[PDB]
Amino acid sequence: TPAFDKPKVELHVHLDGAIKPETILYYGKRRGIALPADTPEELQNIIGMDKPLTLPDFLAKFDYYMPAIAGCRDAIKRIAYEFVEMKAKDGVVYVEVRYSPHLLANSKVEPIPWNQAEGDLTPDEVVSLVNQGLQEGERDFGVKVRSILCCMRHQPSWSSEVVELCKKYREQTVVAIDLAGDETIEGSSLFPGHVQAYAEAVKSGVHRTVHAGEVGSANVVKEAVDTLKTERLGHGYHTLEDTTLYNRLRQENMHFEICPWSSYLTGAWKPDTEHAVIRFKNDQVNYSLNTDDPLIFKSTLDTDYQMTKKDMGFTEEEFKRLNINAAKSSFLPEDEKKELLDLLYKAYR
Ligand SMILES: NC(=O)c1cn([C@@H](CO)CCn2ccc3ccc(NC(=O)NCc4ccccc4)cc32)cn1
Ligand SMILES: [Zn+2]
Numbered sequence: 001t002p003a004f005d006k007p008k009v010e011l012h013v014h015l016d017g018a019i020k021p022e023t024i025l026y027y028g029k030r031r032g033i034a035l036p037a038d039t040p041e042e043l044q045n046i047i048g049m050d051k052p053l054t055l056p057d058f059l060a061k062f063d064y065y066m067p068a069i070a071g072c073r074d075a076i077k078r079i080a081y082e083f084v085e086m087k088a089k090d091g092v093v094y095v096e097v098r099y100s101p102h103l104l105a106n107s108k109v110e111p112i113p114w115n116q117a118e119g120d121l122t123p124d125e126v127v128s129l130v131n132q133g134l135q136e137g138e139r140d141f142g143v144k145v146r147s148i149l150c151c152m153r154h155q156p157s158w159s160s161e162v163v164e165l166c167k168k169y170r171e172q173t174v175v176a177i178d179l180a181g182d183e184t185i186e187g188s189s190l191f192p193g194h195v196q197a198y199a200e201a202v203k204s205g206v207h208r209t210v211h212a213g214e215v216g217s218a219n220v221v222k223e224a225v226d227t228l229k230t231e232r233l234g235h236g237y238h239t240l241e242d243t244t245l246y247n248r249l250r251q252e253n254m255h256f257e258i259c260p261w262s263s264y265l266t267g268a269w270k271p272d273t274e275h276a277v278i279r280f281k282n283d284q285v286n287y288s289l290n291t292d293d294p295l296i297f298k299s300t301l302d303t304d305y306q307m308t309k310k311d312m313g314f315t316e317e318e319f320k321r322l323n324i325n326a327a328k329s330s331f332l333p334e335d336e337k338k339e340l341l342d343l344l345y346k347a348y349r
Pocket of ligand 1: 292
């Protein structure tokens with residue numbers, strides 16, 4: 001089946017969205033939380049979706065499961081490990097995984113997320129754990145994994161912690177800072193907390209990417225580029241609204257992290273229209289193919305090499321164009337990006 005049986009690069013996938021039903025059932029059972037169901041396969045079909053939903057409809061999915069993972073040191077380290085394992089199945093050679101350390105903790109964070117009482121798991125040692133399982137999976141599974149820490153739009157207060165986390169843990173996997181989600185809250189991009197944390201990123205040489213243009217206007221993409229100084233765009237679909245900002249990102253050539261299957265189950269793209277990616281194809285844009293959230297969207301990388309091969313005419317030459325672009329625009333040190341380019345060029349010819 002797989003549309004592309006070659007190795008892949010993936011840049012845009014969220015850790016708290018690539019958990020296996022099994023492990024949630026497992027920690028929820030052995031901590032008390034009680035899911036909506038007790039078998040592995042009926043949790044999936046109510047925690048995963050298959051028709052566009054709404055934000056609210058969408059954020060409840062996390063309130064099923066996140067209480068049974070957060071908090072527990074053991075779980076935090078497990079999902080990282082198991083994340084690397086399931087990516088190897090996808091045929092990924094290099095993958096950048098993103099997540100918010102605060103949302104996985106139940107102390108030193110205000111407010112405490114998901115609904116949990118206080119404890120002693122702090123954002124700082126949450127990322128250290130994740131770091132562990134990630135490096136553990138890498139050498140157990142043969143997939144190169146780096147980390148991305150996410151700032152939360154609605155909580156500029158956590159932003160300055162994230163940059164520090166990114167700098168303290170640089171080398172230990174984490175390679176950049178991110179922004180999401182819900183980019184429709186007014187002027188979130190210009191939240192002082194956010195912009196000055198991104199300013200710290202630039203000062204300290206931390207790579208930068210931003211969720212922009214997925215469900216927001218072309219102006220959110222703008223302030224991400226000109227203010228937050230992003231090097232990559234998360235989605236960046238709506239920059240088709242402003243043709244001069246588009247031609248200018250053609251020309252700077254910026255990376256768009258496309259998520260095709262995500263964009264339908266969210267509503268970002270309506271079916272009875274261009275998909276933003278066909279245009280990036282025809283126009284030779286720098287872009288990638290990515291999964292976003294394999295748990296919530298019942299999918300694997302192969303569901304969206306498939307959707308593009310099948311409903312939109314991608315052939316395998318663009319498939320491989322797009323994975324060498326993804327490798328180029330990776331947040332990898334100049335030497336390592338170059339050993340990864342070497343592997344792929346030879347694997348593809
Ligand atoms: N798909 C995603 O955007 C997404 C975000 N996360 C995590 C972080 O790794 C954040 C979870 N989260 C907590 C508050 C919050 C607010 C908004 C969003 N997501 C968002 O607004 N996505 C756009 C969207 C619109 C409509 C439907 C579905 C998604 C995620 C949020 C996981 N998946
Ligand atoms: Zn995302």
